[PDB]
Design a protein around this nucleic acid. Structure first.
Lengths: 96, 51, 77, 63
RNA sequence: UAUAAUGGGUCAGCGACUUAUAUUCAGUAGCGAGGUUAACCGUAUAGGGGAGCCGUAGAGAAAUCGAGUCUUAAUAGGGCG
RNA sequence: GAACCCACUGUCGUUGAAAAGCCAGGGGAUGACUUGUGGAUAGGGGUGAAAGGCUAAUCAAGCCUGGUGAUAGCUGGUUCUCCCCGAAAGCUAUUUAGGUAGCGCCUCGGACGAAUACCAUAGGGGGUAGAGCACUGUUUCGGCACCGAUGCAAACUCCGAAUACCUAUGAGUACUAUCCGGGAGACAGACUGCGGGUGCUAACGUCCGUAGUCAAGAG
RNA sequence: AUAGCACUCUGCAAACACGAAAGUGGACGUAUAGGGUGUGAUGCCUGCCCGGUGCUGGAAGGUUAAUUGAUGGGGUUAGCGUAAGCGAAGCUCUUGAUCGAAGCCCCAGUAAACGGCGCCUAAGGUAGCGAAAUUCCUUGUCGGG
RNA sequence: GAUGCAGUGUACCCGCGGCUAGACGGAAAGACCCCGUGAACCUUUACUGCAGCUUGACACUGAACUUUGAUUGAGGUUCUAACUCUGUCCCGUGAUCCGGGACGAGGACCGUGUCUGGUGGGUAGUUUGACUGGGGCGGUCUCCUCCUAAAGAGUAACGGAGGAGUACGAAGGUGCGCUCAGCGUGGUCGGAAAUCACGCGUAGAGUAUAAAGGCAAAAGCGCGCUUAACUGCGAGACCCACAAGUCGAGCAGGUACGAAAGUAGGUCUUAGUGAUCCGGUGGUUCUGUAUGGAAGGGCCAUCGCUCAACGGAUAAAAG
């Protein structure tokens, strides 16, 4: 596969670009709706890992506005987008 | 034969253009006014080695 | 022996692209020509390579006009 | 066994929402003679052509 | 190709698209914004085992941001969503 | 010149008496001679008065076992039945030319449906057939580089079709056209008619465009 | 292949050969001997060329490998500065001063070394032979049979 | 190149002895020829590596005395203790091995280990293109113009004819201004053909370069001022298997020339070219393997190939 009869291949006649970031491998993304799986009112990295929405080897997490939540939460040490923060406040939670 | 050369901004931003010249007919160093994107103004540019 | 010929150039695909009575949009190329076989009228622009293009939306029309009798292409809105 | 990736292709192709992005050629070393329009228009990323998408899929199964 | 192109003297028996792993598409069944366990324990096709994997969000080389994001002096224009 | 050692000519034999011989002739025959027994030299090595000769009927690199089921774009072969559809031998690239890859041609599923095709009408560019000498070139005959007459041209044009091609509207008849995805085969073509190059206006010759048949189709 | 001839190497723990070493043959020999190479009884003999390649001898003039490590530049480190920022020891990264043999370049000898024997070269064939194991035209021409 | 097809001629059924004209008779997947990015062996001033030989530095490796050069570094002359002896004698011993003891001749040499330059068909692995009216020899391999090309595009031959691998800080931009060339008449050493006046007919002049298509708002010619031979883009379309290629209205910023409307994103256009990997240079609000830095990496601009067998097997290859 990738042999075209002798003519320079597609993957060899194009340039290489970019580099790999180490911290991106340990950074984790979390949808807003997944907080329902959390047991309890405290949302933290440890609680997310316990709920199995974040892998154990990750070192930080981010929450994005993807779904909907019908519960009250308190977020500790987790980055929130503007929309996710607004949704949490509307649902009746708090940050820090 | 024509030789490649660099025209460096006088402003010190490091911006440079690249062109060619005939050494026999143009021994002198090249002046020219050109636009510098970094400082967004028209300034003088000096001939220099393409290197 | 051998022959000193045997060379040719690649094709260039020249000619008319939109014919009279058709509809065009601004920017559509109408004529590909090496020289100015056709000239530009209203709403038609000329490129550096003598290409004729439409600068407005409408209907293409060919005509013969002038003392020289040269051919013109224009766009009617 | 597990399928193995073609690392040479993995270093040239990245995945988008509906396809693959790539960089363009003819911008490495010979640039003085090239026009400014070509210099600017050859910059940036483009999309892989549909005809060649299949080979990229074969060479990069897990991306 | 009747070919004066190849193979077969005849009969009986044997003789060539398989298996393991990974992946992609289709059909079919379970569950369903969720789905599923691996090694392993287990008088063992049961039961337990949630580590892990796929899906649920993209943009950007990256920092980073995020229903937006990259480019740019620019809320302009444009690319990918 | 016998024994013994050789192998110059001819006949026979060539599924032989014989995987190298018989018969009739031929050479050496006290020598660099012939021969028994037992030892030494081992494979990129040995030995060779030298032919790449010999090294167990095997030698431009012995034999046996193992790597091993080596690789082979090459040649051959590939086993029961019925129904539906149905190609190509082209373009581009290639240490490529009898291989392969993308596109074109086949098939199945999904989506989508007349947005399609034939014909009629309407609009549009041309520089070919023919023709001509107004440019370029060339030809003959006359009267003063010119003038009158006359002829020619793929790379000449003052001219110029039929067809072909593009766009819009419309009657009738045809589940057409386009998109997404699964699976291919194929990339050695042949003859004939028409317009041509090449050849001798030769070839069941060769190279293009275009239509029909064969390929894959019997009567 | 041979008897004969000639060139060259070898002073003995010889040269040369086999072997991974130990060691063995050469040889229990010693330049009248041993190895390599070419020609090939005998008679008459064996012309010219050292430009090229090789070999032998000399030269010390240009080039430098390891090695050695002058100088320079950089990172970090202390203290000072309202602020511009200024900025050392030590450690560390990098540079290549000088020293440095052969070999190559250079000069001379060597053809019974390889090789060459048509204005130019290094010089363009002495003796002897000749349609020949060499001659294309060719069944060259003349005489014998 | 027919016992088996078509039309015709001849021919009752079956042996034995002989013969070789045919059954493209039997025998051995043609050795001749060509091909495969097959094999082997041989050659060399093909590519590349090693054995062998050889140069120097460090170690084995010590003492004393002297000479001469640019603190060091090159010699010379003696010595004996490391070290050599395939030299004599004594013992183990009954022995031309070996070991030890004594003597003698050499001796800091020779030789060996590590490193390093040179030589290296002795040996080893390899390479040595394709097209082609068979192959070889010759020619060609990429780009531009015309014809073949059948009045849209495209269209082959070792078909017919020519060019290219550049040039220009003006030969670019703008405002303004001007038209060529050819002939007929008079004039200086100047006439077929040198400068200059008038008049006639007419684009045959020119356009950096080959040809084609073009060129009066001249795209031809001159003058002044200038750097738009800009930066960020870019509606839309041509061409295309991909990689690529081509034209472009219009918006923002800063400019040049114009009183101004306005023109300018290199030159009348179509040839003047080279992908990827690797490395160099200027910037960089990116990254920085515990932390702060740095090194290294990424991004923007740009430099190094006649990779011409010109989609470019390896960095390096003949018979």
């Amino acid at each position: 596969p990738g042999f075209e009869g002798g003519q320079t291949a597609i993957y060899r006649r194009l340039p290489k670009f970019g580099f790999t970031s180490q911290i991106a491998l340990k950074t984790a993304e979390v949808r807003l709706s997944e907080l329902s799986k959390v047991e309890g009112d405290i949302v933290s990295l440890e609680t997310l890992k316990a709920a199995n929405v974040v892998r154990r080897d990750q070192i930080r997490a981010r929450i994005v506005l993807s779904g909907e939540i019908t519960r009250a939460f308190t977020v500790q040490g987790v980055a929130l987008t503007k929309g996710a923060k607004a949704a949490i406040e509307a649902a009746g939670g708090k940050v820090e | 034969m024509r030789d490649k050369i660099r025209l460096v901004s006088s402003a010190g931003t490091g911006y440079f253009y690249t062109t060619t010249k005939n050494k026999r007919t143009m021994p002198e160093k090249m002046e020219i006014k050109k636009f510098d994107p970094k400082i967004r103004q028209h300034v003088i540019f000096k001939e220099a080695k393409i290197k | 022996g051998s022959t000193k010929n045997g060379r040719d150039s690649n094709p260039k695909m020249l000619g008319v692209k939109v014919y009279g009575g058709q509809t065009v949009t601004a920017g559509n190329i109408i004529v590909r020509q090496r020289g100015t076989e056709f000239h530009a009228g209203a709403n038609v622009g000329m490129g550096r390579d003598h290409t004729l293009f439409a600068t407005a939306d409408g209907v293409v029309k060919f005509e013969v006009k002038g003392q020289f009798g040269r051919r013109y292409v224009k766009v009617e809105t | 066994a597990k399928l193995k990736t073609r690392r040479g292709a993995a270093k040239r192709f990245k995945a988008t929402a509906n396809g693959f992005k790539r960089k363009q050629a003819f911008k490495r070393h010979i640039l003085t003679k090239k026009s400014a329009k070509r210099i600017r228009q050859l910059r940036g990323c483009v999309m892989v052509h549909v005809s060649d998408v299949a080979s990229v899929r074969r060479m990069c199964p897990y991306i």
